[PDB]
Amino acid sequence: MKDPKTLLRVSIIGTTLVALSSFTPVLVILLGVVGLSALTGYLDYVLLPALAIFIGLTIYAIQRKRQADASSTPKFNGVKK
């Protein structure tokens, strides 16, 4: 009887935004790595640490692909804060 239509609507709206802000931030790490490489001059590796990212990210979609229906985090899985 509560009919939490708009109540549930706020999660998708706020819940859709995490992934948007959480997907771009990776690109920043590479430049910093390169920046830090100036110190250790290991920027040569970059190609390798990037393999980890492609392996890590490509895998991540798939986890979201099965959950894609779920979209938001499972109701059972949550924290106090």
Neighbours of 56 (CB within 10 A): 10
Q: Fill in the amino acid letter for 41.
A: G
CA distance 80 to 2: 23
CATH number at residue 27: 1.10.287.910
Structural domain range at position 74: 1-81
Number of domains in the chain: 1
Cβ atoms of residues 72 and 11 within 8 Å:
yes
**Structure method:** NMR
CA distance 36 to 77: 37
Q: Contact at 8 Å (CB) between 61 and 45?
A: no
Q: What are the backbone dihedrals phi and psi of residue 79, each rounded to the nearest 5 degrees, phi first?
A: -130, 160
